[model samples]
Structure formats: structure tokens, C-alpha cells
Target: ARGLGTARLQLVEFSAFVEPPDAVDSYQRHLFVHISQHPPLESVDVRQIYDKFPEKKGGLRELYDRGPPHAFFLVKFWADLNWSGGFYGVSSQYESLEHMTLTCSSKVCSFGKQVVEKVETERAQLEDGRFVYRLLRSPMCEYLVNFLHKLRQLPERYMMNSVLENFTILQVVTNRDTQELLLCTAYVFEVSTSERGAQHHIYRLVR
Candidate 1:
């Protein structure tokens, strides 16, 4: 009964995941940091990830000013008209759930220590659920887009461990202001991939 064909794409609570004590790595640790530490003005080492918005620029001033991300959320997807659901998460969200099993259409996905909430679902989209659509419009988010495109090229086998449904992890960040952050989800069957890797297509929710 427990197999890929029977898998269901769901959003696992951020707290539900118990990463191994040693699971930390560059990709996981520096995920939010587009830029690294300041290594002096003259040093060759890069301070941030992008030059235009690394420390915030003309357009990136808003969210970057909020002082890094406070929370991260997973956006699970299943083709709006595709095959049956298996699992969405790339790893534990897939493997550890039932067996180290690599379920088919199902998957799991993301954020951080400053968690505000948790969500799980079998649907393809989250309907007006207190999510901030503006963040998806930021230049930094665009920067992240290009970054992911390149990162997916590496030969690292498990870069995407689990066979995810159509999905992406959204980092809920803001500027020097309120502390409210929430999640939103969407469902689409045809997941896209190219030289840029698994592309997480986001949209500004329209009324």
C-alpha cells in the first residue's frame, strides 16, 4: 500500500523535519546569504552574493533592510493535470516518511529557526492564506532565480535528493518593521527544468 504510486504531495511542518546533527553544509547554511562575511575592503573574497543587491541597492532596499530572513516555507506543487501524486520532498521528506523509498509524484520542501508556523497539504495551491505576494517581486528574488539556475548545473548527485512534485522553498523575509510572515502554495502538473535546473515559478497573487 505504501509506494510511489500511492504517494501524496504534502507540505511537512518545518518542525516536523529533524535534520541530522551534521546535515549542515554550504548550500544549507549559506542559503539565505547571497553574500558572505566582509573580508575587508581590499580583500579579493566577495562580501555578499550579488553586487547590485548583496547589501541592498536602489531596488533591493526594502526587504534586505528587514535584516535577513526570519522564516522559510515550502511551496509544494503537483501538475494541475498530470499523473498521480507520490512525494514532493527531495530527501527525508520523501525517504524517511515511510521507507528510504523514492516515491514518484510526491515531494516535500523549507525555512529557519525563527519559524512562525507550519503547513501541510495535498493541494497544488494555497488560496489567499495570509501570504505576502510582494516578496516575490523583489529584485533579490530575481537574483535568487538566476542563482538557482546556475546551482542546478553541478554534478552533485543529491542536489535534489527526492523526486519532488512541482515545488520550491520560499524564504519569508522583510524589512525593519512588523514580524508577520506566512505561507502560500500552488499546484501545477508540468514541472520545468533546463540548464537552470528545477525552476520554481512564482507569481504575484491577483485578486
Candidate 2:
């Protein structure tokens, strides 16, 4: 039977740490990603001080503690060109593979804290009978839009064979002092598969 799932996302904050003339929108082509079962220090779901963020309703702590059943993917789309302007993104997915998201991309969206209030979904069947879910749309974040724009340019083969799989992990930090949200420290790992099994590789992504 075909499978179906849901991707409920809440991007409370996204800050770009780049100098002038080097905003998050600058590096669209150079994208690197890190997929893992654990998220970064600032990851809200598992943050040490999540209670500080009163707006963050509910919690994924229960899900995250379970281990491999869930995963997180962090994408640094621009840092590879030159760690100066580190444009980044973070996302988490459940084991059922219900939430497949592409942030900083054109075809999809990466929203700000405002959208956190409500994350609605519309049913849409995927081309492959293996999955079915709602597509991400609406108010857009330019950084994510630009990021996804470059991401979708990759060949379908590369995405399917090398970059994609059933997983999740992403982090965007929120500062209570300044009440600022930042997308800092992003990394990507390449997953290479062979006949015997699968191997995960990491790249610095440089010029």
C-alpha cells in the first residue's frame, strides 16, 4: 500500500551572519547538508532552555529522545564558498517519513517566526506512489526561497541517489536577550551507497 505523512514545521527565527554585500541570498549554488538523529545546541526541540521561549507550543522532546526513529538535516547553502557569510537552515522529520521539507528553496518555503502561529496543510499526492503529503507554500522567506531555488537545480538523479532519504534534523537559534532568531552553524554530509551497504561522507565544501 502507498504511504502518507505530514510535515509540521515551525521556523521561530532565522538570522543571517554575513557582512554587507554578502547577505544570506548571495550563495545559492554552493549547498552542503548534515543529516543526523541529533540537532545542534540551539535546536528548539531539544534546547537546554526551551521554556524561555513561551511562544513555542508543545515539544518534540519525547520524539527526539527515542533515537533513530527521527532525524534532523541541517543545510549550509553558502558557507562552502567562504565561511564568511554562512547562510543556513535546519529541519526535523519523523520516522514515518511524513515530513519531507526543502527550506531556503523556491519550489518550497522557509518561513519566519510569524508563521509559527499556524502551520496548515493541504493534501497533495506525490508522483511516487510510495508517499503522499501536503506541499509547503505561502508567505516566503527570501533566504529560503533563494536557497531552494538553487537546490532544485540539481539533477533528479543526484537528489534521489545521493542527497535524499528518510530522515530529519535542523536548528535555528533564538536569543531571548535580543529576541533575535539566527541560522548559524550549518553543515552537510554526503551519503554514498554501495552494494554491501551505505557509507556517510562529509565535505568541507570549498572553492
Candidate 3:
């Protein structure tokens, strides 16, 4: 609509105040993610946005190839974006990045101790089986959540509660887990997270 009779790239950013964690009994996540071309964008989807960008050689083939042009461990198109030079990328998980001329180490992805214990115990009986696991590993829109029944908590309840982009509060109930994941439409990209610029504006967001 910006005089182009069409929308261009979709962008996303995750903005939050960091001050260390775990030292307390319960970790409180107080992150304010910025999203989109405005009052401060803090989050967005990577896959959907991937479809909008202009096709590169082999249609973003370099991202999938990851060797000469580049190489990577894991990759996902969750529609990561930016307005500065209008950069768009698909990071495998949340809170990390990489670009045409940069390198982004994925945030230290982790699973809670209680969560891990529960998953190992219940995974043998994982009711949903490959269905849920597949969704988490390769989400269509962007992210998925499968909180494995016992702790059927909503992963999307907290923005930062994503395991490589999949956000499931718990892992059991279908309706509850589905709804929780569905309601959560926002995802994030933390570009170097320093002071001022990174926290306030997309133009300021960079690696």
C-alpha cells in the first residue's frame, strides 16, 4: 500500500529488559518486545514473512544451503524482519540472529528441570506422538507448543517461553494446548540487545 499497490517484507523484533535470572525461586520474565513499523515493534512471525520477500537465487536457497554463501546448524523461516536496509531473516529459534554479512549465535535454548523430567517420563506414552513433535520441530506459521500433558501449561502465556520457536505451556490437553499456542501469534528477534538504539527503534536494531 505504500504506493507499491502491495505490502513488502514483514519484520519482527523482541525487546526486553535483561537483569539475569534463576537466582530467585521463580523467574519472572518482564520483556517488552518491539514489533513492526511503529510505536516500536517487539515481535513477529518468520515463516509467513519469508513468503513475502523477493526471491533470491533459487528462492533463498542460500539460507537452506548454508555452505559457500554460508552454512548453519539449524534454520527456520519464521519471518524475521527489519526496516533498516529492510533486512529479513528466518532464525531457527527465538532471541538470536545472522545475516548476509553477519553471524548470530542462537540464544542458549533450554528446558526446565521439571519440564525435562516430565517429558522423559511421559514421552513413552506421548499421546499425540509424531503429530505434536512434528509441529514443534517444523511449525507451519512459525512456532508450536506441546507441553506434554502432565504440565499442560500454555507456553505462549509468556512471550519468551519458546523452545526453538515452539511455545507450549504444557504438553497434554489438545484443546488447551492448541488454544494456547494459537492465541500466541507474536515471536521475537533480539538483535545484539545492548542499550538505547536496540531497545527503542528498528533502525537501531542490528547485530
In order, what lDDT does every prediction score? 0.23, 0.29, 0.22
TM-score: model 3 vs. ground truth: 0.18
**lDDT (C-alpha) at residue 51 in model 3:** 39
lDDT of 1 by residue, 33-144 (tens): 1111111111111122123121232122233343222111122232111111111122112111221212112111221111122222221233343221111111222333
Q: Tell me the spans in candidate 2 whose CA falls farther than 4 Å from its real position.
A: 1-28, 32-122, 126-128, 132-140, 143-207
| Of 1 and 3, the candidate ranking higher by lDDT | 1
Model 2 residue 176 distance off true place after TM-score fit, in angstroms: 31
Candidate 2 lDDT over 1-207, as tens digits, reads: 001111332232222222323444664422233233321122223343222222232222332333221233223222222222333443332221232433221112122112222233233234443332323223334544354445445555347324323122233322223323211122322333223222223221111
- Weakest lDDT window of 10 consecutive positions for candidate 2: 105-114
Q: Mind giving the per-residue lDDT tens digits that candidate 3 earns over 1-207?
A: 111000111122222222224425555322223333323223222334333222333222223332221111111223211111111122221211211111121221123111221211101112222111111112111111222221223344233324334321111111121221110121223222224233332211111
What lDDT does candidate 1 reach at residue 161?
28
In angstroms, how far off is 47's CA in candidate 3? 8.0
Top model by TM-score, which number? 2
Worst 10 residues of 3 by lDDT: 1-10
Q: Give candidates' CA RMSD values in order.
A: 19.0, 15.4, 18.4
* Least well predicted 10-residue stretch by lDDT in candidate 1: 34-43
